[PDB]
Subunit: 91 residues, 4 copies
């Protein structure tokens, strides 16, 4: 479950990285950063896509990627972080 | 369920698009972009409504639209994305 | 339930409105706008508190207000919007 | 439960505060503010990390810290705020 969600999240972020560096001209690391803060809904305080293609893609990217990203974060905190913490509280 | 949530989400976004392009003077695509990042809570890093009417509308728009938009995203990821993925993992 | 959550949400927003207009010098409508986009986690793309008092208050305001605001949004969409829609789909 | 989530949240915020003030050169209060609005997904409207190290750290920080922070907010609103309110509504 976690493995699949991890892979799916990675693929989604690679797509965003490729899109923004190509269409919006961002450096790859910046394209990845924007993709991550967008899908996790944190948002970026400085960059907004400047092209209409970028705006349309971002709208679709958000609707299709938010569920997955939070599905991964949700399982990562309950199936990987909770135990490593829960079992730790055991005297 | 998904169909109705889809339609409701679309209608909500059309209202925002019309409002912001009219009252805030945004190009339609920009009004749609702002409506989407606002209701999905990603937020925009460059635009904030400049008129008091725009600020009041945005406040009400957020409270009334967030639930719906996330209801659609939630069902889209579980009733349309989960299966298309779950059934795929079947050897 | 909805009534109490509504009142609590209103009181929380009034406190933020008073704080930001007083300490950060925002016009009341702007203080309310900032309080709303902050607690709903949409965030504002232009304003960040400029005083240390404002930054500390905002940190505490977020932790104490996010739960409530989303408790209100959650119930508003399920106990007031769902029915008005669910009952409507009835031929 | 609440105590542990509180401590874990505090430790996570201290790490962010140290990272951003050191690598991004922010004043400690600003580093804490950025860490908080980032992990609660509110986001900051003015600051984005400027170094590649800062961008990479922020990406990892978000994925590892969002679950916890919202686990704390969730329990704080249900196991500490709900009762103090629920018991109050009792005539
Ligand atoms: Rb958010
Ligand atoms: Rb934001
Ligand atoms: Rb700016
Ligand atoms: Rb945000
Ligand atoms: Rb900005
Ligand atoms: Rb922002």
């Amino acid at each position: 479950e976690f493995q699949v969600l991890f892979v799916l999240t990675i693929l989604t972020l690679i797509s965003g990285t490729i899109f923004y560096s190509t269409v919006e001209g961002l450096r790859p690391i910046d394209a990845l950063y924007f993709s991550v803060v967008t899908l996790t809904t944190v948002g970026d305080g400085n960059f907004s896509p400047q092209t209409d293609f970028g705006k349309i893609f971002t709208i679709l990217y958000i609707f299709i990627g938010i569920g997955l990203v939070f599905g991964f974060i949700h399982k990562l905190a309950v199936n990987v972080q909770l135990p490593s913490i829960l079992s730790n509280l055991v005297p």
